[PDB]
């Protein structure tokens, strides 16, 4: 299985208050391991996943000083953007950042990320090459020239190639059992009426980790695709995941249909049919 690390930072402006709310959240493989929130009692980065508690007080303070710096940056940056668009100060607005690196199952760096969004839309993003900038909205084209000519690409590129990947490897070793564990999915097929003469076969995968999974339906062992209903993979709430795929088949043809489950934890793809009774 692949692996990833992300830091998500957000500032949301609040009409009438000088300080935006700023929140930084760190993730490994989409799972939270640290968090900072300025609206807390006394803000500081906090440990979220239990394996993260092996970082000492110095670490939290070092990260905390980074958040405190960024908080002012986001305040100023939100205000400049508020200015540029001649927007009203009586509304709420959102400024976001996400950085980090993607690791393949061979632990190569696959992509480094540095991107910003305003109001939920790409504003500017560092391309996969870590050398060039893609400015979604014209406003950002001014910034792009600034950050190309000034050549501030290698600054962030080095960190993504270096520290991002070194700390992600550190966490995987320290957190192996939960981050490296796989759980095979538990699968079954249920059978549901739809209308006279037609039924829904629904293919369930329960309790798996990681979340990546592929569900397919096959007819005479030919994977159809069209007319297949699927749902966004969802957390079970206990650390594992769920997904299902359903298809409508004519009454009595159910046994020609096969669900296939592909998942890191399985040693061989699963093949299921609806099994009446038994």
């Amino acid at each position: 299985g692949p692996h990833s690390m992300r830091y998500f930072e957000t500032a949301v402006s609040r009409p009438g208050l000088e300080e935006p709310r700023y929140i930084s959240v760190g993730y490994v493989d989409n799972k939270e391991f640290v968090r900072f929130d300025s609206d807390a009692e006394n803000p500081r980065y906090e440990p979220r996943a239990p394996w993260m508690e092996q970082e000492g007080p110095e670490y939290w303070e070092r990260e905390t000083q980074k958040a405190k710096g960024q908080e002012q940056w986001f305040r100023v940056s939100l205000r400049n953007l508020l200015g540029y668009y001649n927007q009203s100060a009586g509304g709420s607005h959102t400024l976001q950042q996400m950085s980090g690196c993607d690791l393949g199952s061979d632990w190569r760096l696959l992509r480094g990320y540095l991107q910003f969004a305003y109001e939920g839309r790409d504003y500017i993003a560092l391309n996969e090459d870590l050398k060039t900038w893609t400015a979604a909205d014209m406003a950002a084209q001014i910034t792009r020239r600034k950050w190309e000519q000034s050549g501030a690409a290698e600054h962030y590129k080095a960190y993504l190639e270096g520290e991002c990947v070194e700390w992600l490897h550190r966490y995987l070793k320290n957190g192996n059992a939960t981050l490296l564990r796989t759980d095979s999915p538990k699968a079954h097929v249920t059978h549901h009426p739809r209308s006279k003469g037609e039924v829904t076969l629904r293919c369930w995968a329960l309790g798996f980790y990681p979340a990546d999974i592929t569900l397919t339906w096959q007819l005479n062992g030919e994977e159809l695709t069209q007319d297949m209903e699927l749902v966004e993979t969802r957390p079970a709430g206990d650390g594992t995941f769920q997904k299902w795929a359903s298809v409508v088949v004519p009454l009595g043809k159910e046994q020609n249909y096969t669900c296939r489950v592909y998942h890191e934890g399985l040693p061989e793809p699963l093949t299921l049919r609806w099994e009446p009774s038994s």
Partner: protein, 332 residues
């Protein structure tokens, strides 16, 4: 023929360290002009000479205040001994949108307040490059063929180099088409179609949702690049089937609406015996087709009166200039 076009513009203050510091700034300025081919407080003045053709831009803006379009504009130092500036222009609802780049021969006086080469009243300059879309935001139907407009003019002397076409949407950004100087490099089955207007309109066929988002026709020339962006929204109107179910006790009326992207769904119910709208609506979890449209079910529970009623489950959605209906009836 021969004419002059003018526009209230802003312009950015030269202090570069600060620009590197944060994403934008708010420093004011004033207006810009040029000679065209038709066919108390003070403002700065920019005087730029037309070499090349500015495409459909002239007429478009000649009747722009008359047709009632709000026209942003903003000039900038392509920087941080001559000097070169770049402007951007947006016509809002009409849609033309453009990047111009300009030069000044410099040896010969400058303005103390701002570092701009001035001359007999004004900043004398001349424009040698443009990049326009006439299609700033575009809504196509799923699977149709999208042509995303992009022109550009080069002043003779400029050799083109690339015509990158990137997609940025949501989290990710990926290349689409890459025209080098002499060969193509499509990554998503897109064809691109003596010193005057060119065309770089990308063409996209059989759109699938992965094709939705923000496209950056990026025209890298010999000295400088000028991007223009085109927003591609993709619409898939739903289809709507009302039917009842569940065995005549707990008469659960139920409305399947599906095959629709984007996520916004409005579901209005009607009951009659000419009575109107009603309430108690209730939805289902969010499942999606394989291609990435969405499905859901509004399971308003049926109450027959004493002889019967008609329940009219309708939705409205982005593509529909009209709410799609489904009428069924019901008994004791």
């Amino acid at each position: 023929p021969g004419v002059d076009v003018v526009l209230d513009c802003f312009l950015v203050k030269d202090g570069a360290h600060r620009g590197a510091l944060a994403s934008s700034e708010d420093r004011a300025r004033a207006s810009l002009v040029l000679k065209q081919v038709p066919v108390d407080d003070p403002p700065i003045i920019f005087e730029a000479s037309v070499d090349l053709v500015q495409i459909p831009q002239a007429e478009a803006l000649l009747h722009a205040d008359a047709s009632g379009k709000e026209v942003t504009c903003e000039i900038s130092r392509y920087f941080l001994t001559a000097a070169w500036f770049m402007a951007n222009v947006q016509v809002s609802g009409g849609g033309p949108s453009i990047s111009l780049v300009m030069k000044t021969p410099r040896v010969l006086w400058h303005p103390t307040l701002n570092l701009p080469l001035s001359p007999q009243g004004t900043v004398r300059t001349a424009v040698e490059f443009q990049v326009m879309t006439q299609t700033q935001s575009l809504s196509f139907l799923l699977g149709s063929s999208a042509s995303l407009d992009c022109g550009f003019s080069m002043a003779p002397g400029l050799d083109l180099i690339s015509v990158e076409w990137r997609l940025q949407h949501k989290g990710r950004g990926q290349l689409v088409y890459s025209w080098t100087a002499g060969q193509g490099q499509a990554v998503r089955k897109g064809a691109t179609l003596l010193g005057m207007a060119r065309d770089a309109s990308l063409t996209l066929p059989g759109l699938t949702i992965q094709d939705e988002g923000t496209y950056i026709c990026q025209i890298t020339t010999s000295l400088y690049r000028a991007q223009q962006i085109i927003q591609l929204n993709i619409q898939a109107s739903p289809k709507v089937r009302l039917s009842l179910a569940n065995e005549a006790l707990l008469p659960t009326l139920i409305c399947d609406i599906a095959g629709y992207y984007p996520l916004d769904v409005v579901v209005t119910w009607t009951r009659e015996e000419s009575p109107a709208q009603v309430s108690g609506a209730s939805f289902s979890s969010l499942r999606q087709s394989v291609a990435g449209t969405y499905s859901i079910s509004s399971s308003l529970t049926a109450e027959p009166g004493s002889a019967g009623a008609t329940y009219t489950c309708q939705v409205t959605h982005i593509s529909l200039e009209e709410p799609l209906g489904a009428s069924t009836q019901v008994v004791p």
